[PDB]
Amino acid sequence: KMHSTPKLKLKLTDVASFLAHNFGVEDPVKFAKEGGKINLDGHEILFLNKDEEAEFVEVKSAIGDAKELLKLLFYCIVDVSETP
Amino acid sequence: EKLRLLLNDKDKKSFTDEELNLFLEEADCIYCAASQGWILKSLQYENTVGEMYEYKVGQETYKSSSIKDLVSVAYQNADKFKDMCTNKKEKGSFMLGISTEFE
Amino acid sequence: EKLRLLLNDKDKKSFTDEELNLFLEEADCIYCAASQGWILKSLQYENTVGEMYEYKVGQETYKSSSIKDLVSVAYQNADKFKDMCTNKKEKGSFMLGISTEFE
Amino acid sequence: EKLRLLLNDKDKKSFTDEELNLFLEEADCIYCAASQGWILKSLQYENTVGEMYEYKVGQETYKSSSIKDLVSVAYQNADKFKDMCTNKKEKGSFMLGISTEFE
Amino acid sequence: EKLRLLLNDKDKKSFTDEELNLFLEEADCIYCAASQGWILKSLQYENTVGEMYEYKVGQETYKSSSIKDLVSVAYQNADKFKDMCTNKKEKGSFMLGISTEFE
Amino acid sequence: EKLRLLLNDKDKKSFTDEELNLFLEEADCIYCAASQGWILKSLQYENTVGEMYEYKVGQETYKSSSIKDLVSVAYQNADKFKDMCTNKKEKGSFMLGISTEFE
Amino acid sequence: EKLRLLLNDKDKKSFTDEELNLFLEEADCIYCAASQGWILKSLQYENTVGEMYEYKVGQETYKSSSIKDLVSVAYQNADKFKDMCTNKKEKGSFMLGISTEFE
Amino acid sequence: EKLRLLLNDKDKKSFTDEELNLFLEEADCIYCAASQGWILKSLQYENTVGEMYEYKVGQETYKSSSIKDLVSVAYQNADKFKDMCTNKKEKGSFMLGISTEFE
């Protein structure tokens, strides 16, 4: 839940100006304190200048080796109870 | 008064007023007009301060800035006004919600 | 008072007060006004130093910094004010939440 | 008048009106004509300054900018007018649709 | 006393005290205020040591440091005070923990 | 005593003891105090060498290092002392163990 | 005798033995002490050879090395002594074993 | 003979025999001793040339290499001796076997 969904990252020339112009957020600090959650439709397009860059900060897996350890614990639990 | 503002930006008593009005008509933003005026003013240095930059006569040596330095400074002024004009026009980056109809 | 602060943010007694109020009306920040006024002051050096930057009469020799050095320091002052104003206006990076509605 | 604007856009007295009209009809935009005329003007300096750019007579001394600096400023003027013409003709990037045919 | 310490940091007896208190109001950190004072003192070199850096009269010649060198040194002092303030306030990098509620 | 160490790390007789004690109170380490004091010392050169760094009187000529070089050596001293303090405080890389509770 | 070695690692009679043995106590290896002493000796050039590097009076004319060159040489000596001390301290880079208990 | 070989390897008649012998017991190879002794000799030039490197009395004029050039050659000598000693100690690459143990 922390990291499995990718986090879109923008390297903007001016963060405050970009936020104010796009999302109308004049007081971004107060927006952060207010728990202000931006709303995006799903279908968005970016218009950056030459310098600015946008990327997804994506990870191959958020839980790592949890699957194998959980499987091992399942096997051990079945073994202790010796259930068919 | 826009003409006074240009004649203060672009230094005065070089051009007459009607061509300043033409400059302003050529571009709505006064700074673009001032940059245009400065680049056309840089041509005036061929007459106001000729190629002869230094001379001595008798007991008087006068060394003035060569035409290259003056025209370079005029181009610096023109570029500065152009940049200031673009700064006036400039807008930041944007991201918008694209969409399309579908059944 | 903005005019009083600006007359010392830029060096005193070259411009008239109406022009300074015009600069103050052009931009909210006084530092931007000071930067633009410093460019305007830089435009004056053509008459002062372009026509003569070092001369010698009789046994006396006087030399002053060329127009390039003086216009360079003036542009440096204007650019420093521009950078200081932008640094005053800017804010750091920060990550924010996001939530698209769903049912 | 376009001829008047051209004679302003470069120096005024150094060419007959016929060849300026020739430049005007050579290219549509007047800035291209001004650039070409400025290069043609730059040609003149092989005589004025190439033959002698600083001479001394008795106690009198006279120095002028060398031919390299003069043709440098002339070419700079011509190139600036060329850039001005291209920017006047310049247009931004675009994004268009495609329409094939199928059945 | 902040006033005396600023008159020592920013060199003494070219301003008067009320604007020094104003500069202290501009930023609580004394070094930032001293830096701003250093820029606004570098501006004043145009009067204290004019553009005429060198002159020979009679049997005396005096070669003052040009305005560019003095203003460059003043900006260097300003940059040192700014860096010293940032050194005073800046903290290093460090790791933290994330918390998230779950059923 | 740290006061005498500071007086030696700078030139001895140029400052009152009160401001030296102020430097010592600001930063506990002697080297940081000396580094800051050397910048403060560098600020003096606008009033001894900035106004005149070489003059000639009659047959007598006197030249001294320009303000740029003197400020350069003073900043070099301050930077060297700052690096000395940081080297006194720094420590090498390390390799530690992790442990987490688990049942 | 370590003190004789130190007073040979720099020209001798600019220092007094108290601060010399203080330097020796500051660092076990004599070359770090000599480097520190050389850095502190570079300061004293401001008095022994002031900023007035060249002068002419009557028919004498003496042109001493500037203070910047002398401090540069002093810092070069300090860096060489520091490097020599590190060479004395340095141990080769090499590999070792690992062993952890296990049953 | 090592003392004589060193007194050849460094220009003769500048150090007492005690100092030379001290260099000998300082380092095993005589070349390192020669390099260190050359650095120690390089220390001397501040008195000889820092205070004066070119002077003119009456008609007579005398010039000599600056302290920078002289300390540069001295350091070049010391560094070249150090490199030559290290090259004498230097040995080429190798391939060696491994022999672990196993039942």
Place this chain on the structure above:
Amino acid sequence: EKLRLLLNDKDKKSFTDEELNLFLEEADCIYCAASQGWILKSLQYENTVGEMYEYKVGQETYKSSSIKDLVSVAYQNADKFKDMCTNKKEKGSFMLGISTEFE
């Protein structure tokens, strides 16, 4: 005769024959010995042509190559002789074939 060949590989009557045959014993390749002799000869320039490179007395001015240039030429000669020695001994690249016993 090897000694005569060395006295031609480096100019004559500056070294006594014991130094020469010591160099030859130090390295079989006579060019390596000549390089060693040349670097040791570079030290002699401190005496043969002192730091005073130029002087004028009366109406008679003499300017000699500085000591830095002479030692640079000596080091260049030493490097050339070293390169000649390496070119004498060095052989090119080539393949081999390994064979290890096996059943």
Place this chain on the structure above:
Amino acid sequence: EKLRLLLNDKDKKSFTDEELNLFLEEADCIYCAASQGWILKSLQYENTVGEMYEYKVGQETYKSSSIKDLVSVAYQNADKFKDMCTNKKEKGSFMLGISTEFE
């Protein structure tokens, strides 16, 4: 003739023909002998030009190329002959076959 070819390549008759024959015996190729001889010739410029390269007596002023320039041309000649010999001895790249054994 080989000796005559060397006496032509090297500038004619600055050295005894017997050591020229010694050079010929050192390397079979005439060009390597000429290159080594040119380095040996470069060695002698110390006496000719090192201790004086431009001097003035009375009104008469004589100047000659510095030792560095003369050594540069001599080394350039030697290197050019080295390149010529290497290109005479070189051979182009080419492909060859392989033929192992099998049954």
